């Protein structure tokens, strides 16, 4: 049974060199963004007078079309600008800078992967993005900045041509995922290590990607708790580092010999933001 230290050695010995990553909302709570399913703090537990008839409506079309203001309220709160990346994002960035990142798959819509300098080409934003928007009536595309001012101003963005509601290219429930998601067909077989960070893996088809790596490939989980197939049916090369994700990441960074470089990179980063 492999250890965190084992995984560090595989990377240090260059035995593992094509890392794919999967992340969820757990990687953004340390930046101040509360998650979905944590008791008390999680958005699916606590939101009275978010004006939502029940919490899951936030990303449901029927409700959006009946009343889009709750969704744009979350947009106002999450607009790349008012939260910062944290050590978990900088670590991913550092994986890219050191030449280890095959691909980063995120369920998050906070944009903090891009804000931290990970290039779009290394990124699969599986649950969509605010980089762009689409009119819900006439399908004209707009750059995401064209709706920044409306959201700040508390207006519902509308199409200059047809007056329809314009919606960021966020994936709602029932909709399929962006075609970039199809990169998994290539990425997962090519990977020689899988990292899973800050997710409960309760959403599909994103969750199912845990199974798409070969059986000789280690799957490393850094998360408050055991989840998915590391919970119900472990493979022999699975590793769980349970606890706070930033602590799990800080241990790994230490076992890898990257502690000064990390804190360096923050500097040129959280400083220059």
């Amino acid at each position: 049974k492999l250890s965190l230290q084992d995984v560090a050695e595989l990377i240090r010995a260059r035995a593992c060199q094509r890392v794919v990553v999967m992340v969820g909302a757990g990687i953004s709570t340390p930046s101040g963004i509360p998650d979905f399913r944590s008791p008390g703090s999680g958005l699916y537990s606590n939101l009275q007078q978010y004006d939502l008839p029940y919490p899951e409506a936030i990303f449901e079309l029927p409700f959006f079309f009946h009343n889009p203001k709750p969704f744009f309220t979350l947009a106002k709160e999450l607009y790349p600008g008012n939260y910062k990346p944290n050590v978990t994002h900088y670590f991913l960035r550092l994986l890219h800078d050191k030449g280890l990142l095959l691909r980063l798959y995120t369920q998050n819509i906070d944009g903090l992967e891009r804000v931290s300098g990970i290039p779009a080409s290394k990124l699969v934003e599986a649950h969509g993005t605010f980089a762009s928007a689409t009119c819900t009536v006439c399908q004209r595309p707009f750059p995401g900045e064209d709706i920044r001012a409306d959201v700040m101003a508390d207006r519902v963005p509308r199409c200059p041509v047809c007056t329809g509601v314009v919606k960021p290219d966020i994936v709602f429930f029932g909709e399929p995922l962006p075609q970039r998601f199809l990169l998994h067909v290539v990425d997962f077989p090519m990977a020689d290590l899988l990292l899973i960070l800050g997710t409960s893996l309760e959403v599909e088809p994103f969750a199912s990607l845990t199974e798409a790596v070969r059986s000789s490939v280690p799957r490393l989980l850094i998360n408050r708790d055991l989840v998915g197939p590391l919970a119900w049916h472990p493979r022999s090369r699975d590793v769980a580092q349970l606890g706070d994700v930033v602590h799990g990441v800080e241990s790994l960074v230490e076992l890898l010999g990257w502690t000064e470089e990390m804190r360096d990179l923050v500097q040129r980063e959280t400083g220059k933001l």
């Binding site: 429930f173 309760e202 959403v203 599909e204 088809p205």
Partner: peptide, 8 residues
């Protein structure tokens, strides 16, 4: 077809 975003 059956590849939509859903909770399991």
């Amino acid at each position: 077809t059956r590849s939509g975003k859903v909770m399991r």
